[PDB]
Design a binder for this molecule. Sequence first.
Ligand SMILES: CC(=O)N[C@H]1[C@@H](O[C@H]2[C@@H](O)[C@@H](CO)O[C@@H](O)[C@@H]2O[C@@H]2O[C@@H](C)[C@@H](O)[C@@H](O)[C@@H]2O)O[C@H](CO)[C@H](O)[C@@H]1O
Ligand SMILES: [Ca+2]
Ligand SMILES: [Ca+2]
Ligand SMILES: [Ca+2]
Ligand SMILES: [Mg+2]
Length: 845
Amino acid sequence: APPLVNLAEEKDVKVTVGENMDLKNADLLTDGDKYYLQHDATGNKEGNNWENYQEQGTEVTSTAEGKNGVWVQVDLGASYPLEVINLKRQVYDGQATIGNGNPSGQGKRLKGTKISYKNTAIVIGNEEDLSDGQIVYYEGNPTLPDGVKQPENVSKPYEEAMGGQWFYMDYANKNGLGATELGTTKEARYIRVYTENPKGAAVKFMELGIYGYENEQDVQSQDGPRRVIDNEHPMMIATAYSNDVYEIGQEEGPELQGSNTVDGRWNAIPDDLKENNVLLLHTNNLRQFAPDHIGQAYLQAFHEHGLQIAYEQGAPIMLLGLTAAATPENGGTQYNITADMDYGWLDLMYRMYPNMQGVFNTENFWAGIHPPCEGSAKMLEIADRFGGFFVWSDQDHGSTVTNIVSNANMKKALEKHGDAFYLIYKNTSSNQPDDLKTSSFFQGSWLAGYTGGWGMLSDTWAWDKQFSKLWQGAGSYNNWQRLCGEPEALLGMQMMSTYLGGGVIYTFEFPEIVYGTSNTNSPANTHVLTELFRYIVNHPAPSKKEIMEETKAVLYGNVSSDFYSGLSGKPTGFQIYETGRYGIIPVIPTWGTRAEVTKKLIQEADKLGVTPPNVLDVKDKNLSGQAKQKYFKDLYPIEYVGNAFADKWEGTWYLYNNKVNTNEKQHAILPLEGEEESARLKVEMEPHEFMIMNESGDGTAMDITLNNYRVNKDEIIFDNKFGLTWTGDFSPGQTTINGKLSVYKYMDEYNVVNAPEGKLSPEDNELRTTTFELTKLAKEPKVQVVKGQQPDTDGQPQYTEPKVEFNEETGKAVITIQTNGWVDLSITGLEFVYDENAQKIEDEP
Ligand SMILES: CC(=O)N[C@H]1[C@@H](O[C@H]2[C@@H](O)[C@@H](CO)O[C@@H](O)[C@@H]2O[C@@H]2O[C@@H](C)[C@@H](O)[C@@H](O)[C@@H]2O)O[C@H](CO)[C@H](O)[C@@H]1O
Ligand SMILES: [Ca+2]
Ligand SMILES: [Ca+2]
Ligand SMILES: [Ca+2]
Ligand SMILES: [Mg+2]
């Protein structure tokens, strides 16, 4: 257990009241329950109806005539450093009803009249009569203990809330309501709460949480950030979705999609990569549409439970803070139990769990604009106060970033806390060609210093919108089938392109396919993600300085989707390029006027010691399409010839075949280093392959890593040879739809890395050819596999031994290999001589 605890709950406390007061059911004050839900075992429903909100609690009643004010006091049994207090009293005058929310007819919200209590005060101390009392909070005019002085600044009443009220130990910080620095404590044994009900002599106290430490040695402090996210410290996020089943008080940790667990996902990660990974707790459709009491209870219980399990395993955590515009801010939806977030609870999670790091937001604007901005503004402030971070994932059709800045509170929060805020793409709607513009916006936002970084969320839902079987269009298959169809190597190609643009966050869905099921690692995870991510961890991406230095043009405004065609590549929806010649092309959205953005970018460049790029409005005559190619070709020299993607960056060539789902070979012809400048490497690749090449520099050697890992889904998924049920319906006794269960069955039984007996190795044994032509050489070069992807349990090879043909009379050496997966090749004994016929590395006339 972490050092910050609810002492009121953990200790054997004594509860008392003043003379002429009656005390009833004292144990309810410190039972950890603020909601008194009764039907947890049946999904918080009795029949088809959500259970009512029924408020129970410790009742204190004045029996002194004409004097309704009461107090209740807790003796913790010893003096402890206290940091936070949470007080909740009866919220509703009478009983609240369950009425219509947002969206109308599905969302549910409590309705009724809320109580605003008066003459509320909180006093703590180390004498039982509190003659040494210190004021934590004071509203109205309750008579304090003898020896405790009236405070100068007095609070006014507030409306009681579902989560209660939160108090901290700095009276000068908003009269005790203002959240303090981690570890701001006062030592006390006795805690007294004063309250007067506006109607009558009785107050029901539903909970008094008193959070502190066992001793002063355990008191925490804010000594720096919880993590660094940058080119030298990249971060992979894996989403841990609730399976939508949970019961408050259950012994076992929350079940995740695909028979996964929080601890299980963490322990599946290779040890050397754990420091660059985080788990995102996502509530998914847990208690979806539920009214306030059920929503808040389940949001809190699910996240706390995940945090605790993570804490025991040493796993850092992000929480889903906001999706589907489901926020407690005015106008919010109830599409998710994030609707019932209590910002006091979110603060508590950072104080209680040292492994709590970040907040995640995605997919809001289809459902509402300003509510998710208002909520994100508050959560960004909280995250950054604790040295944490905030990630916002979305595709930008053109108004995503401008919507964010159009909200005054979010704009202001970004100005103060922007260094802890990260924008990552999300290519779910792959059929809209906004992938490349999104990356440009997000890179541009970072480059100019409005945000702390950028990155990627690649979603296999992208495949659903366009394709099915290999080389085929969507056809008439179920969407859960098409979800499974994406080539594994393509995920690596996407990672490579994000890396080259100085991206620092990497995340993938559908998690049960890309990371795995049943706490195992999937084929994608094992043979692509973990391999390439290890390269990214050990070979830092370009810094902001390096991006700035290589960038000759920055655009301003809402760049056209189709701008990239005939430049870096046609937007495919899959976040890949035809060439690396121009980089990502940073486009700064309208964070301010062109002049304001220009000044900001110049300041950022100056700070890095770099020449500022020129800023052009997207509408500039030079970017028209006739003149755009001329303008960009004059700024950025050609590096290689051919139709494959290639980028040379700091001595290393990065390549891929850039066809998403068309079976075409592509090539790249590279000028090689050394004394002989006519030296050439031609690479030819079939689709779904990426490559990293490093020359020795003296023209004698080179190392090549290639990866073209692709599982064939044609028979198992699309022909459906095992007769799985791919539909959106529930089957008898199931809380998960058939389509999902089928994905899980595929991953558990039919596509298993190192498949044990009775399970199938992945369908990955059909190999494809990569060829390398080296010219002009005097003698045959030497090739060998340093390391290669090993067989699954079926014994079938993932590569064949490389073959070298060398022609004496011409310079040409041809190296051929067949792979499905990764190999590290080493080529040595290269003796280049002058080649008058060497391919010219230049543009066409
Ligand atoms: C009902 C259901 O099973 N949903 C799962 C599914 O949800 C995603 C798909 O519906 C997809 C179709 O193209 O659209 C996505 O927006 C949707 O994502 C989910 O909902 C949005 C609002 C966000 O909260 C996302 O974080 C969330 O994933 O697939 C996801 C995983 O891709 C989950 O399993 C859902 O349970
Ligand atoms: Ca209680
Ligand atoms: Ca380059
Ligand atoms: Ca080198
Ligand atoms: Mg195999």
